[PDB]
Amino acid sequence: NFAELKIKRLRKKFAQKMLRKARRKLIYEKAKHYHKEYRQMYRTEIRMARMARKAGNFYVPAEPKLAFVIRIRGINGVSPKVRKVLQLLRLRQIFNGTFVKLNKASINMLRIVEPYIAWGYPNLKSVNELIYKRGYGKINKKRIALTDNALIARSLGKYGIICMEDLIHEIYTVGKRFKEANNFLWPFKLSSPRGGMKKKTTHFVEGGDAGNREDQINRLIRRMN
Amino acid sequence: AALRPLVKPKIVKKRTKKFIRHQSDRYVKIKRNWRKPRGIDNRVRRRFKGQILMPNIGYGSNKKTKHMLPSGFRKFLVHNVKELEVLLMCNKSYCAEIAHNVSSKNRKAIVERAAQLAIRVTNPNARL
Amino acid sequence: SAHLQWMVVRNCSSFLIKRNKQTYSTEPNNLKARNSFRYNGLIHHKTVGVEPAADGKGVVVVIKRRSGQRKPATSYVRTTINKNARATLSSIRHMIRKNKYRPDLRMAAIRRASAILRSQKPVMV
Amino acid sequence: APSRNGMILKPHFHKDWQRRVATWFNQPARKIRRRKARQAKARRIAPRPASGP
Amino acid sequence: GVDIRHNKDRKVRRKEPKSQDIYLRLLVKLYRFLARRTNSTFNQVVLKRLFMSRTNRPPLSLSRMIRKMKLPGREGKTAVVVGTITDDVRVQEVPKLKVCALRVSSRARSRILKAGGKILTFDQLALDSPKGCGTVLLSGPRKGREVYRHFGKAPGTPHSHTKPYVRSKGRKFERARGRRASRGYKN
Amino acid sequence: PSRLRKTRKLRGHVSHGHGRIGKHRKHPGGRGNAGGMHHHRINFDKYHPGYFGKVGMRHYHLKRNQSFCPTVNLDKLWTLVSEQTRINAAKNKTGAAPIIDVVRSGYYKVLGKGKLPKQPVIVKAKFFSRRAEEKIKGVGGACVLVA
RNA sequence: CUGGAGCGUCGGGCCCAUACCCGGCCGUCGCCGGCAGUCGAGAGUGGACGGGAGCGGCGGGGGCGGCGCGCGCGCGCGCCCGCCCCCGGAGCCCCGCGGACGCUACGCCGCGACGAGUAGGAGGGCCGCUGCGGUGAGCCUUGAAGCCUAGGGCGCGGGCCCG
RNA sequence: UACCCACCCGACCCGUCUUGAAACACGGACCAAGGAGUCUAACACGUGCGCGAGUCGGGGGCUCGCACGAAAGCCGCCGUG
RNA sequence: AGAGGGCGUGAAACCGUUAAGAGGUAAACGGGUGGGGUCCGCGCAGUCCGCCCGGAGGAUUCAACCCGGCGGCGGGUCCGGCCGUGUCGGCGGCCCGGCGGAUCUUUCCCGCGCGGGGGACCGUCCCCCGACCGGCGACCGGCCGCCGCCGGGCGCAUUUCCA
Numbered sequence A: 001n002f003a004e005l006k007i008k009r010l011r012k013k014f015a016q017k018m019l020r021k022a023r024r025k026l027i028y029e030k031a032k033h034y035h036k037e038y039r040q041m042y043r044t045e046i047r048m049a050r051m052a053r054k055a056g057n058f059y060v061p062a063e064p065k066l067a068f069v070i071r072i073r074g075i076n077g078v079s080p081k082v083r084k085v086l087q088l089l090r091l092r093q094i095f096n097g098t099f100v101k102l103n104k105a106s107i108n109m110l111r112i113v114e115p116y117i118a119w120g121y122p123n124l125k126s127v128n129e130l131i132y133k134r135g136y137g138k139i140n141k142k143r144i145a146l147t148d149n150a151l152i153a154r155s156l157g158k159y160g161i162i163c164m165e166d167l168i169h170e171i172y173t174v175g176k177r178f179k180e181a182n183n184f185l186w187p188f189k190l191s192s193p194r195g196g197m198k199k200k201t202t203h204f205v206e207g208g209d210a211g212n213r214e215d216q217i218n219r220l221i222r223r224m225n
Numbered sequence B: 001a002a003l004r005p006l007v008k009p010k011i012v013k014k015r016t017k018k019f020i021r022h023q024s025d026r027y028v029k030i031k032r033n034w035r036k037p038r039g040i041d042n043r044v045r046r047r048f049k050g051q052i053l054m055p056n057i058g059y060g061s062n063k064k065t066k067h068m069l070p071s072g073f074r075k076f077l078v079h080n081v082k083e084l085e086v087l088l089m090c091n092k093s094y095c096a097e098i099a100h101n102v103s104s105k106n107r108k109a110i111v112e113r114a115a116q117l118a119i120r121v122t123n124p125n126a127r128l
Numbered sequence C: 001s002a003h004l005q006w007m008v009v010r011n012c013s014s015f016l017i018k019r020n021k022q023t024y025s026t027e028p029n030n031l032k033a034r035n036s037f038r039y040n041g042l043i044h045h046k047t048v049g050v051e052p053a054a055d056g057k058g059v060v061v062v063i064k065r066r067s068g069q070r071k072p073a074t075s076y077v078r079t080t081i082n083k084n085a086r087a088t089l090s091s092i093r094h095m096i097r098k099n100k101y102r103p104d105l106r107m108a109a110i111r112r113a114s115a116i117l118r119s120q121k122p123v124m125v
Numbered sequence D: 001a002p003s004r005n006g007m008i009l010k011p012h013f014h015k016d017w018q019r020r021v022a023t024w025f026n027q028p029a030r031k032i033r034r035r036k037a038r039q040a041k042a043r044r045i046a047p048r049p050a051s052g053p
Numbered sequence E: 001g002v003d004i005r006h007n008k009d010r011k012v013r014r015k016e017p018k019s020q021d022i023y024l025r026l027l028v029k030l031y032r033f034l035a036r037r038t039n040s041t042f043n044q045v046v047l048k049r050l051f052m053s054r055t056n057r058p059p060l061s062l063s064r065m066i067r068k069m070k071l072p073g074r075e076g077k078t079a080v081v082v083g084t085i086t087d088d089v090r091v092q093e094v095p096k097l098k099v100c101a102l103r104v105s106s107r108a109r110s111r112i113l114k115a116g117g118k119i120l121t122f123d124q125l126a127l128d129s130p131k132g133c134g135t136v137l138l139s140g141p142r143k144g145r146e147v148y149r150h151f152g153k154a155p156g157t158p159h160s161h162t163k164p165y166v167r168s169k170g171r172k173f174e175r176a177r178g179r180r181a182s183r184g185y186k187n
Numbered sequence F: 001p002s003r004l005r006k007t008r009k010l011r012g013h014v015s016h017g018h019g020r021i022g023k024h025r026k027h028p029g030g031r032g033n034a035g036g037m038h039h040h041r042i043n044f045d046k047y048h049p050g051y052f053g054k055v056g057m058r059h060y061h062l063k064r065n066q067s068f069c070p071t072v073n074l075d076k077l078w079t080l081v082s083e084q085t086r087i088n089a090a091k092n093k094t095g096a097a098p099i100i101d102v103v104r105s106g107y108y109k110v111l112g113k114g115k116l117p118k119q120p121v122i123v124k125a126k127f128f129s130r131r132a133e134e135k136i137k138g139v140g141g142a143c144v145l146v147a
Numbered sequence G: 001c002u003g004g005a006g007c008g009u010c011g012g013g014c015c016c017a018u019a020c021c022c023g024g025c026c027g028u029c030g031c032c033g034g035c036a037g038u039c040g041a042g043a044g045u046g047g048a049c050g051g052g053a054g055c056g057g058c059g060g061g062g063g064c065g066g067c068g069c070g071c072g073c074g075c076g077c078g079c080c081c082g083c084c085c086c087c088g089g090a091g092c093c094c095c096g097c098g099g100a101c102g103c104u105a106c107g108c109c110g111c112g113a114c115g116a117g118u119a120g121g122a123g124g125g126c127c128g129c130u131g132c133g134g135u136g137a138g139c140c141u142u143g144a145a146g147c148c149u150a151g152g153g154c155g156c157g158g159g160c161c162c163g
Numbered sequence H: 001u002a003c004c005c006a007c008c009c010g011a012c013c014c015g016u017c018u019u020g021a022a023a024c025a026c027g028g029a030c031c032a033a034g035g036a037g038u039c040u041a042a043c044a045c046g047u048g049c050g051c052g053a054g055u056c057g058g059g060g061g062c063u064c065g066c067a068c069g070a071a072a073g074c075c076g077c078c079g080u081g
Numbered sequence I: 001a002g003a004g005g006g007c008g009u010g011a012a013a014c015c016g017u018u019a020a021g022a023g024g025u026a027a028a029c030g031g032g033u034g035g036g037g038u039c040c041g042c043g044c045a046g047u048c049c050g051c052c053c054g055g056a057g058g059a060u061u062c063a064a065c066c067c068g069g070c071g072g073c074g075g076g077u078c079c080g081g082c083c084g085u086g087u088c089g090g091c092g093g094c095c096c097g098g099c100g101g102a103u104c105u106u107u108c109c110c111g112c113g114c115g116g117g118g119g120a121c122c123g124u125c126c127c128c129c130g131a132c133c134g135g136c137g138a139c140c141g142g143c144c145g146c147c148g149c150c151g152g153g154c155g156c157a158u159u160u161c162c163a
């Protein structure tokens, strides 16, 4: 009894030091595409512009699929058709931001709220800094901090998403489960832009802060993480 | 060197001052006592600037250190001897206050019972 | 039953006493004057009490019998203990536990007894 | 001024109920005033059906 | 600066019974006990009714508990009711039942027991079947109360036929400006 | 009691649950059921339809004793008489059929609601329904009149 | 105030709200919340009990892996056979044999989340006044109510408590 | 924390009617004491408790000089409604 | 008599003077400090206590053990009896068990078809004993196991007290 049990429960114990090793290993080698793709995607865009330029000839890189949108103005003196979109983008509060999947429907939702937001096609280190530093998840409908990744796996393990790095394909590459990756992900509440805006009111294009800033949103994100 | 507490935490008080009533200063017919001002125009109530502050909730006190005397022992209003033996176990977290209207002879009786069984009394040395 | 009496006696009780944000219970044998289920004397069917001995020295340990209650006179039995602090507690400990008789009070009964003892000795300088 | 679903009500207090209200704090002393008749009449007519003919 | 309506964030469900009757409060206590624990939904629902009001736990009639236990499959189960069972003077072949109720009117008591049935209470049920295994939840008709006929659109609106409240019905007591089409119109 | 009223919670509360724009003035509408045609119309017409007007025919001096006539449904005769008088019969083998004076239990008329148990009866009553007739007949047993 | 402290177009740098971030603390709502005496952390069963046998095993995917493996099954001891034994004692991070100090079972505890307000509602008021039924071996000529106090305090505060 | 005093920043007098009051609108010298949503009938919904195809309440009766009592108890009344 | 003939108490406005501090933007107010006072805690070291332990001093009887007694607790054999739940048997209370029923007999009795009474029936509630089962806080008796108190034994490397 005792020493038929003693063993029986120690097994379970070790059958775990299998398992929580195995997974730990899995994550680590997943993280290893997540280098290799993550590099190969860079070079293979340069690769090709380099290829084009050799002929008398010419890229147009893939249109961006991902554009995290920062709301930049507050919440009073706000039209309706706007305020509804801004709470479909979950940008309720002033000057938080979400990872939005560009898309004829979504792009055209941003036209209509343009004067209040600031979006751009963000870059890896942007996604990283954000998911890492300011990425809490929605678990039982709660802003809960992503400290161990038994919290990600716990919501998203049914999409082959098991760790903080597996989230981060599904957040460039869009992937199949952009939707559900970017909806345990709870809108990222970003501090005031350190060193300050240019002009909250106007299009970037005319010196302001609003709507599209291609690429240049990554200056903006450094200042607000 | 009296009856130390079980635990002496840092007591913090978000505001230490009283909550006087609007214009309790000008008029003598007004007691300092809060009466919440429901004037249409009245400046206090529309929380206006550099006016008297209004007693609101979230500007109230820490659960642990609530209700707690500077030394540590929250009062009991001990009122004869028999009521003192109630604290015999809860001696070290909170103390006896001997009621105003106990007569000098039993004001004594209670005190030396307290000291016998180590319960602080805040007015031990009072009537005499 | 116990659980029922309680609900009558929760509020509305002559040995209950609530001033000044506490509540308390002056009944004979609860240990630590609490308003409670566990630490209440009467409600229940097995009860430990600890209180000072009438002589000035020692501790009496009151144990409810449960042979036949609704029999207040005899329902409910006492014993003196004049020993030397350590054995005094070891007696209460051995009386409650290893007699499986409400091993909840267990410690409270000790803490009481211990507190009783300190109330009876050279009081002060 | 009615508001949203009741009955009509013609309570009849337009006259002067106030003056001519009888309260009944006799009721129990009356009960007894009576008792003493039932009682007395019987003891007076000794052998005779107390109730009446 | 968050831009939610705070209008009905607070939900309005009852989360203790409003009564002070120690026995309800006890068998309620008994299943805060069970309903937290055991997987069975049953005792959530029973909990959620011990809880509810008189007016909103209407009484079951015995007759209706017959035709809810006559049905195919339901033999051998316990009928369970968070409320009262009453008679049906207009029923007679009472089958042998097993019931739970908070109350059972004393005449229903004798009718059930005469048939060699059993009646349980909201504690004995908890020992019989804590998970609610082999049971049948039933309630009385909540759209029963004569009150409920007064409810709806209104009397006087088009072909929506709803009791008006009238001090005393009769010939002269609402039959005119709006019911005979001869006398103004009608609805 | 006084203690458990809103008027306690409305002190320091100036207008007193009653509005300081339009005050609580004495009798704005009128007095009682007043303005039924004019201007309180929308209640009376939408909420008490058929109030305003005559209808029907006078019966003037009228006495209910003249037209006292309670009702019973077949549904529950097998109540009126002590249930043992049914258990006796349903059995017995002679076609007894107990008699039921719906008179004696207090009803000037018997009506055909409900099932009736398969059990022959003699119902003595006053003003029978048709259906009450048919059901009793079709069960077995008879319909006797009383004055 | 004047190659300006004027006016165009522009830089850096800095200053500051009750705005955002992090933290602190006090409200409320929700969590089908946990907690009325129990194992267990992307939990991915557990247990009889038999017959047979043993170093067997379950000799499956650059999957990168998820469900099976390298802290043990069997073993150290008693000596190929037995065992693999009892918590009134394993010595305990799991303990299912009995359970907080904690469990006023309308008590307490963790999460998150949120708490501009006239009229009005609603709730909560060991907030306050006077009356009675209970109850407090309440208090009191060794001094009550009131009254008075630049006498210590407590509540967010109604007030409350103390000199 | 409170008394006086000192400084720095803030700062219009409340109440009210009012689209808008510090109002060059009105009430208001100061203080004590008194002072304004009450009772009843009738509805209605909401809820609490009893019993449940019933259930009641009187008004009557039977049981008190009441100390408590002008109470409580009980009645094919109990259903004449 | 700081109860003096409009006298218990004896507030505020208000005024009476004593002390302190201030004082050209009327006072008065909010936030923040600073100085000073009246008082209030102390300290003529506040070094705060509580375990356990080691050491060195000093002092009583024990604790560990049995044995006599007393009192609990728990266990069961339900052993024996008493108790009550569900079942069965007795048709045994049934008339020595009642009450309810418009059940039935005027085969009965009394009084005038009716009333009262008696007799038959069903539903209910009691005895006998026998059997099963919840064997239930409802005990009570023995046997047990454990605890506590009292009294005996144990004189001191023990077990207490004190510094």
Ligand SMILES: [Mg+2]
Pocket (backbone or CB within 6 Å): A076, A077
């Ligand atoms: Mg604006």
Ligand SMILES: [Mg+2]
Pocket (backbone or CB within 6 Å): D051, D052
């Ligand atoms: Mg008469």
Ligand SMILES: [Mg+2]
Pocket (backbone or CB within 6 Å): F013
């Ligand atoms: Mg208001």
Ligand SMILES: [Mg+2]
Pocket (backbone or CB within 6 Å): F015, F019, F020, F023
């Ligand atoms: Mg007004």
Ligand SMILES: [Mg+2]
Pocket (backbone or CB within 6 Å): F021, F022
């Ligand atoms: Mg108007």
Ligand SMILES: [Mg+2]
Pocket (backbone or CB within 6 Å): none
């Ligand atoms: Mg608010």
Ligand SMILES: [Mg+2]
Pocket (backbone or CB within 6 Å): none
């Ligand atoms: Mg006007």
Ligand SMILES: [Mg+2]
Pocket (backbone or CB within 6 Å): H023, H024
């Ligand atoms: Mg002007």
Ligand SMILES: [Mg+2]
Pocket (backbone or CB within 6 Å): H026
């Ligand atoms: Mg005017």
Ligand SMILES: [Mg+2]
Pocket (backbone or CB within 6 Å): I003, I008
């Ligand atoms: Mg005097």
Ligand SMILES: [Mg+2]
Pocket (backbone or CB within 6 Å): none
């Ligand atoms: Mg006098």
Ligand SMILES: [Mg+2]
Pocket (backbone or CB within 6 Å): I010
């Ligand atoms: Mg005087």
Ligand SMILES: [Mg+2]
Pocket (backbone or CB within 6 Å): none
């Ligand atoms: Mg003066």
Ligand SMILES: [Mg+2]
Pocket (backbone or CB within 6 Å): none
């Ligand atoms: Mg001077």
